[PDB]
Amino acid sequence: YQEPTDPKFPQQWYLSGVTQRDLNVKAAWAQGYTGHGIVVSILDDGIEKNHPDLAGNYDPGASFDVNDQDPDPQPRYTQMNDNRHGTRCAGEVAAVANNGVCGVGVAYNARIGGVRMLDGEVTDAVEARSLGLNPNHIHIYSASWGPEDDGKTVDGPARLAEEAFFRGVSQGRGGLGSIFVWASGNGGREHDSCNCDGYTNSIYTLSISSATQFGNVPWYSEACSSTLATTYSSGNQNEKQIVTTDLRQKCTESHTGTSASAPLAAGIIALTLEANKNLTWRDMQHLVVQTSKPAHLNANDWATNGVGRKVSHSYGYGLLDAGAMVALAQNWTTVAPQRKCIIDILTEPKDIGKRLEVRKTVTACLGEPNHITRLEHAQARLTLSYNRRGDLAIHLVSPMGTRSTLLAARPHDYSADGFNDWAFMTTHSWDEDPSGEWVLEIENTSEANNYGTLTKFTLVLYGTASGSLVPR
Ligand SMILES: *[C@@H]1O[C@H](CO)[C@@H](O)[C@H](O)[C@H]1NC(C)=O
Ligand SMILES: [Ca+2]
Ligand SMILES: [Ca+2]
Ligand SMILES: [Ca+2]
Ligand SMILES: [Cl-]
Ligand code: NA
Ligand code: NA
Ligand code: NA
Ligand code: NA
């Protein structure tokens, strides 16, 4: 195997590293996996389809302009180069290799397109038409953005967009399911908590956070239990950043944020799908859980879950490992059909006051076709009133003792609107047996005399009842 000769490939430290602080992509390339036959679409502000490092892989069938309602996602050029982000993300996935231009994509033989959707008013309809673009041609969708990362917003897909997620994972990709890769957010400096973003908090999105070059949690990172894994991105000014294609046929060394992590993950997922085109959308999440690596990622919240895997709210299961992903994909056995066990927990509304604990012992649909002994995602769907939402912190503890933070205190969130059946999701109990006692904790983290009521708590378990591995 000959590594790429591109002039900035040596600067792509998160791929070309020899120091074990990389995504282990060369190992996948050397196994023969470069993305051939896979199609990825960037949902963003457009794609410079004539960029010298993108044209050779550009796919019009992976592209659309839902802002102007035409097929051509070319960005709108402005003095400030506002609409450059999709082009940066596209190059991360699939910049051409060995062509003397810039660097290379993770999946440098994949086909790449873009949906121009962010350069205009983003409505539910715009979102749905983007998520649902050509779902039997595009394999993987990469989205780096969501509701405002101001640390006070709670929002997610409205009805059309939610329908697009369920149509995508159910009928997309020949019934195997569209793979939606999502950035978990850039709201760290606002103390944002990413389960309040219903796109990344979705079970249908494979959610990705960031680590700095030196292995730290970047200033912009949001912690939450819905995140699955991590890719490298930017950090402080002594740490390197992402090197990729830029607007106006240029090359940037200063692509940043969690919004630069999701495209790298999408590229690794493209390599993985080349290794096994029969992987379902759930299979892909299983592979990520099993192969991601905590080593050398620094966080104070690494915890071992009930099946022996280390998990963090900053990093999920750790750094994506492309070589391990493609290796495990090859002989992967398709997971069983997804079961869903719905448990209405409360017998009466509960005053929250300063602190509320709700304990319930469940059988996880014992005796029914939705019996789950092997959890995937778990949700606590909560309806509650409270006078100042961001003073709340919420935790969910599984029968195996795994404490998922569903919501951290958000100091900017002054809302009096509470949560209306908000489906806080955790990945941290993946593969655990969910039978037994679950504990929900809601706490007022402020000294204020805050008040409200929990009126509904639905525990929703997803998973199967077969195929478990020995704990790690
Ligand atoms: C894909 O997986 C399904 C489910 O296990 C199986 O029935 C089918 O034969 C597989 N197809 C290929 C081409 O491997
Ligand atoms: Ca256009
Ligand atoms: Ca190149
Ligand atoms: Ca956020
Ligand atoms: Cl469902
Ligand atoms: Na975001
Ligand atoms: Na997700
Ligand atoms: Na534990
Ligand atoms: Na149990």
Author numbering: 110 to 581
From the paper:
Furin is the most prominent member of the human proprotein convertases (PCs), a family of 9 serine proteases possessing a Ca2+ dependent subtilisin-like protease domain. The PCs catalyze the posttranslational maturation of many proproteins thereby contributing to a variety of physiological processes. Furin and six additional PCs (PC1, PC2, PC4, PACE4, PC5, and PC7) cleave their substrates after multibasic sequences and, therefore, are often named as basic PCs. The proprotein convertase (PC) furin emerged as promising drug target for the treatment of numerous infectious diseases, cancer and cystic fibrosis.
In all complexes, the central dichlorobiphenyl-segment occupied a hydrophobic pocket in a similar manner, as described for furin in complex with various dichlorophenylpyridine-derived inhibitors. , This cryptic binding pocket was opened after a flip of the side chain of the furin residue Trp254 by approximately 180° and lined by the hydrophobic side chains of furin residues Leu152, Met226, Leu227, Val231, Leu240, Ala252 and Trp291. Additional contacts found in all complexes were a characteristic salt bridge between the piperidyl nitrogen on the left inhibitor arm (ring C) and the carboxylate of Glu236, as well as a polar interaction from the same nitrogen to the hydroxy group of Tyr308. Binding modes could be also determined for the asymmetric inhibitors 13, 26, 27, and 41. The electron densities of the central biphenyl core and the structurally similar left arms of inhibitors 13 and 26 were well-defined. The trifluoroacetamide and acetamide groups were involved in two identical water mediated polar contacts between their amide NH and the carboxyl group of Asp264 and its carbonyl oxygen to the backbone NH of Asp233. In contrast, in both structures a sufficient electron density could be only obtained for the first ring D of the right inhibitor arm. This suggests a high flexibility of the terminal ring E in these inhibitors. The bound conformation of both inhibitors was nearly identical.
